[PDB]
Amino acid sequence: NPGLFTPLQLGSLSLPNRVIMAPLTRSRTPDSVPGRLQQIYYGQRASAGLIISEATNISPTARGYVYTPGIWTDAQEAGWKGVVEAVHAKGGRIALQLWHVGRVSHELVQPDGQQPVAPSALKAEGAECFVEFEDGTAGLHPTSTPRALETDEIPGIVEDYRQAAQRAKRAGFDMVEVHAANACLPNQFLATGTNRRTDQYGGSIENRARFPLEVVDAVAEVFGPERVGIRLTPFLELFGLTDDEPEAMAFYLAGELDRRGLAYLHFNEPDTYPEGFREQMRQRFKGGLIYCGNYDAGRAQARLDDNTADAVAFGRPFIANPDLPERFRLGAALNEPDPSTFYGGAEVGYTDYPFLDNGHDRL
Amino acid sequence: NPGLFTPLQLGSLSLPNRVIMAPLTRSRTPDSVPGRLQQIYYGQRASAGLIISEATNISPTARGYVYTPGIWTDAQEAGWKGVVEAVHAKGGRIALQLWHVGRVSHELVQPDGQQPVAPSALKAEGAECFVEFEDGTAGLHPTSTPRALETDEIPGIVEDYRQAAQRAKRAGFDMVEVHAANACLPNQFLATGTNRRTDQYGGSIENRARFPLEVVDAVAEVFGPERVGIRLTPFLELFGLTDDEPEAMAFYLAGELDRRGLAYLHFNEPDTYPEGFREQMRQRFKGGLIYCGNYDAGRAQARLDDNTADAVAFGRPFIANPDLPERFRLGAALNEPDPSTFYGGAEVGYTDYPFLDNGHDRL
Ligand SMILES: NC(=O)[C@H]1C=CCN([C@@H]2O[C@H](COP(=O)(O)OP(=O)(O)OC[C@H]3O[C@@H](n4cnc5c(N)ncnc54)[C@H](O)[C@@H]3O)[C@@H](O)[C@H]2O)C1
Ligand SMILES: NC(=O)[C@H]1C=CCN([C@@H]2O[C@H](COP(=O)(O)OP(=O)(O)OC[C@H]3O[C@@H](n4cnc5c(N)ncnc54)[C@H](O)[C@@H]3O)[C@@H](O)[C@H]2O)C1
Ligand SMILES: Cc1cc2nc3c(=O)[nH]c(=O)nc-3n(C[C@H](O)[C@H](O)[C@H](O)COP(=O)(O)O)c2cc1C
Ligand SMILES: Cc1cc2nc3c(=O)[nH]c(=O)nc-3n(C[C@H](O)[C@H](O)[C@H](O)COP(=O)(O)O)c2cc1C
Numbered sequence: 001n002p003g004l005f006t007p008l009q010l011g012s013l014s015l016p017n018r019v020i021m022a023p024l025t026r027s028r029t030p031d032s033v034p035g036r037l038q039q040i041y042y043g044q045r046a047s048a049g050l051i052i053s054e055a056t057n058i059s060p061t062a063r064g065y066v067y068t069p070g071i072w073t074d075a076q077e078a079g080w081k082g083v084v085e086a087v088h089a090k091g092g093r094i095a096l097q098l099w100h101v102g103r104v105s106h107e108l109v110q111p112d113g114q115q116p117v118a119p120s121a122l123k124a125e126g127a128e129c130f131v132e133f134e135d136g137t138a139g140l141h142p143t144s145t146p147r148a149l150e151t152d153e154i155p156g157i158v159e160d161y162r163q164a165a166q167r168a169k170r171a172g173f174d175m176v177e178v179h180a181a182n183a184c185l186p187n188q189f190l191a192t193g194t195n196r197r198t199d200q201y202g203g204s205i206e207n208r209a210r211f212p213l214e215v216v217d218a219v220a221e222v223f224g225p226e227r228v229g230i231r232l233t234p235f236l237e238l239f240g241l242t243d244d245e246p247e248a249m250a251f252y253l254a255g256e257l258d259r260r261g262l263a264y265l266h267f268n269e270p271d272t273y274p275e276g277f278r279e280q281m282r283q284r285f286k287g288g289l290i291y292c293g294n295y296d297a298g299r300a301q302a303r304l305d306d307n308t309a310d311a312v313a314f315g316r317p318f319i320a321n322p323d324l325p326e327r328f329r330l331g332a333a334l335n336e337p338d339p340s341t342f343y344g345g346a347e348v349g350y351t352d353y354p355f356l357d358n359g360h361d362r363l
Numbered sequence: 364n365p366g367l368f369t370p371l372q373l374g375s376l377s378l379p380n381r382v383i384m385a386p387l388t389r390s391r392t393p394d395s396v397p398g399r400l401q402q403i404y405y406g407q408r409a410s411a412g413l414i415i416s417e418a419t420n421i422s423p424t425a426r427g428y429v430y431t432p433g434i435w436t437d438a439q440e441a442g443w444k445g446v447v448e449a450v451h452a453k454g455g456r457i458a459l460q461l462w463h464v465g466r467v468s469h470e471l472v473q474p475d476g477q478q479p480v481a482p483s484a485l486k487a488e489g490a491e492c493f494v495e496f497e498d499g500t501a502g503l504h505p506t507s508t509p510r511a512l513e514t515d516e517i518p519g520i521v522e523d524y525r526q527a528a529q530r531a532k533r534a535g536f537d538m539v540e541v542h543a544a545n546a547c548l549p550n551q552f553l554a555t556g557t558n559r560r561t562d563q564y565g566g567s568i569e570n571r572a573r574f575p576l577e578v579v580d581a582v583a584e585v586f587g588p589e590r591v592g593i594r595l596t597p598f599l600e601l602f603g604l605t606d607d608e609p610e611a612m613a614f615y616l617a618g619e620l621d622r623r624g625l626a627y628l629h630f631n632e633p634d635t636y637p638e639g640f641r642e643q644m645r646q647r648f649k650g651g652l653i654y655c656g657n658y659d660a661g662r663a664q665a666r667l668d669d670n671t672a673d674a675v676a677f678g679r680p681f682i683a684n685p686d687l688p689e690r691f692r693l694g695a696a697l698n699e700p701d702p703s704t705f706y707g708g709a710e711v712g713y714t715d716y717p718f719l720d721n722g723h724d725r726l
Contacts, residue, residue, distance in 0.1 A: 004452075005448045006451070006535070007456075009375075012372075012377075014377035016454050016455055019452075043689075044723070044724065046410070046454055047409070047452065047453050047454035048454065049454070088370065088379045089367075089382075089410065089688045089689045089692040090454075090688070090689060091409055091411065091453075091454045091455060091688070092454060093370075093377070093379060172368075325452045325454070326406075326452045326453060329449070351724075352723065352725060355724060355725065355726055358403060361407065361714075361718060361726060362716075363719070
């Protein structure tokens, strides 16, 4: 009968509470290298049971959005090391979310104007990515038509994830989270709409799951499976992605990741799920289960109560409330998020959302 | 090659950094029940890798100092539960330090004016405890002559420690720390000067260690040895205690507590130790080693570097600096402690030591 402030063993990592900071792209690293401003922002939020970083590009060709951080260079690694140290000195734990956008990209953001890559050569209908144009302005821009990866290019991407994890581990991260959600590259492989391959990486459920599971295995070699998680979005349609077998894929992956002893599965809610889905997930996967999507303290506690989650992630409320878990403890009113400063810029709408004033703390 | 901000597995508990808050009696619970003021104070310090609570009386006859908290009633337990929740919501971990003063007491602070108890009927020469007099005033007062515990009263004290741990575990503490240091009851058994018993609880090293090891075993039944620690002060003379065999007892206990798989040993420094002592300790005990006594960041890092400690506790600097680990990260100047408000009173000199102002945080 855990509550939001009951400690949780998430794989081999002890969390102090179950109020998790969801991964949140904020697009505040114009040179791709985290710095002091990120030290501040993440440090402010270090009371989170776990911080899951902003999505972090694992290579140049992984990128779809300018001004987002990377984890393929020495300088990027050094920047994250500083951020991690900052989180640790404030009593926190942080996981790096490992990102490759696949088809959700454009030549203009690719290195040397390379074509985006994907399981299959299908443009994401209606999707926009965020590009810097030749004149130095930036903006949302329709994604372009990707090329289908060659079978022999797939190992190289797995290795890009592996090296990202190696860098993450050296930088001091407590965990990594494989981003297989929100219609990014691993999700593109998982989903029937986006994966029309006829090699060993498409067709059947096992084939579609093959590359994502290679990624999980590679990163788990680095961190241990007990310090790896994965984000999944069964039933979510985003960036043109559709899927005829979301439930069956979810159950297959649950069983495969359970065998591997993964620390957690993290579901971002389409919010629907069929009745019984959450119950099945809890039976099929014996590690940590984290759910995200419009939660507040009451709704989160209900999933603890139903034995369908071990913890709950919060996105927009952690943007706006660096001390979200304390606010939930006291039932204190939350700061309102300002969507106009979710992305880009600097400290405004990033590190200037206030903490509670308990009448004793002094700065 | 860990640094102060390198995570540590301390038994089965993950710590975010190695800057530990030492146990600090503050004498701010006149009714023995922790409350909101303690929620604030401990919450302020929750960035500590681990908070080790103020020494907490395990029963009425355990007490030598008025206005200190207890852990033998429902109401005390409820008060600590609130404190623990506060620490968890701020991202912390907290261990309860389990206290029985033995001979360092007086009839005036004992229930119903009972005589203090000890391994042997030896008054602590020069020692003072802190008493409330009949007229309602309070002050330091010379300790009285204890009675030697009967052999058949020793199990009852072990059970008092066990029940304290049961309460602690229900209240949500992450760990307990057996106080066997600073010349309190278990140390009185350990030391040759204070223990002149001729039953199975005195004489030889094994006999003197017998009661303390029963205490460790009882509390470890509750928490698991992986969530128990013990504080020791070999070579320290306090409250009239002397010892002819400090090194030999330390090595015996090291080996016995290693076999038991205890989470950590915590040494409060007489600071001397013989050359080779720390090295021997590291060989003889394979769990966590924590040292305390006048450390700063440089001196602490040196013990990490020498492979003689896994973490270091700080006392007076955590009184004065709620964000001590962050100050060490930045090399920021520390607030100066005010000894005049270490004990007694209320918020002044307790929750009004300021945090750093990073120029971004707002209250
Ligand atoms: N990495 C990810 O998986 C996610 C990135 C953030 C948004 N994520 C999900 O996508 C959809 C659409 O989110 P939203 O409506 O908030 O995004 P926008 O279309 O406005 O912006 C998309 C991206 O465009 C970039 N962007 C957009 N505006 C800016 C500005 N002004 N500066 C810098 N960068 C900007 C930035 O990378 C944003 O993440 C929603 O379901 C979110 O939960 C997913
Ligand atoms: N529980 C413990 O093991 C410790 C309690 C705190 C002090 N501890 C060690 O004892 C010695 C002497 O410490 P100090 O000089 O700081 O203590 P005092 O003699 O002034 O006070 C002793 C106790 O007396 C009580 N005291 C003393 N003054 C007050 C006031 N004004 N209000 C309430 N209570 C008071 C309170 O419990 C104090 O802990 C030193 O080596 C410390 O590291 C040990
Ligand atoms: C500003 C913004 C940025 C986000 N960036 C990411 C991201 O980097 N990776 C990811 O997996 N999801 C990302 N998301 C989705 C969030 O992690 C989260 O799942 C979503 O906002 C729903 O939770 P909420 O209702 O509590 O905000 C983002 C959402 C927003 C609002
Ligand atoms: C105000 C005060 C209260 C203390 N209370 C305790 C206590 O409850 N239990 C304990 O084991 N030691 C206690 N000590 C000792 C500290 O834990 C610590 O070992 C000592 O202060 C030396 O470390 P420092 O030099 O970093 O302050 C206390 C010390 C002071 C200054």
